């Protein structure tokens, strides 16, 4: 299996699935490094974020647990097709990159907060992470290039 994958079993159904402990992605199918990658993200900040403020809200007071619930809801809507990643990033990301549909542009190793870097480089082109935790908050990451 590609970098970071393990076989698991659904607790609700018993069917095998795959989980990546670097990106926090999970998928039903058996999964299918670059010098630079391009990613977009959606950040949900919380009260313990390094800087608990964003363009959305001057004082961010939500708990980390509440932030994770929000992230999980956005992931659901993105996976179902009810909403686009880009639309949710524009509306709800606690980062000024929201104004660019979450796009951060291209970057190499040695630039980003480490859990974000590692997730970004472990994603395949077009793939989306699960919740990724950094000192900034909790991210959904989409690798675009």
């Amino acid at each position: 299996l590609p970098p970071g994958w393990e076989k698991a079993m659904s607790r609700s159904s018993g069917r095998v699935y795959y989980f990546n402990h670097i990106t926090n992605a999970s998928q039903w199918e058996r999964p299918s490094e670059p010098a630079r990658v391009r990613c977009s993200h959606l950040l949900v900040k919380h009260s313990q974020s390094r800087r608990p403020s964003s363009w959305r809200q001057e004082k961010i007071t939500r708990t980390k647990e509440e932030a994770l619930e929000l992230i999980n809801g956005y992931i659901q809507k993105i996976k179902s097709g009810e909403e686009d990643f880009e639309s949710l990033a524009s509306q709800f990301s606690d980062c000024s990159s929201a104004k660019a549909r979450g796009d951060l542009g291209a970057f190499s190793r040695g630039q980003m907060q480490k859990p974000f870097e590692d997730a970004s480089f472990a994603l395949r082109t077009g793939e989306m992470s699960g919740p990724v935790f950094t000192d900034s908050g909790i991210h959904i990451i989409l690798r675009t290039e």
């Binding site: 993200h41 950040l43 800087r51 980062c95 000024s96 990159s97 040695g110 630039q111 980003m112 907060q113 480490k114 974000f116 950094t134 900034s136 991210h139």
Partner: peptide, 5 residues
């Protein structure tokens, strides 16, 4: 700045 090291 967010989310740079």
């Amino acid at each position: 700045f967010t989310x740079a090291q």
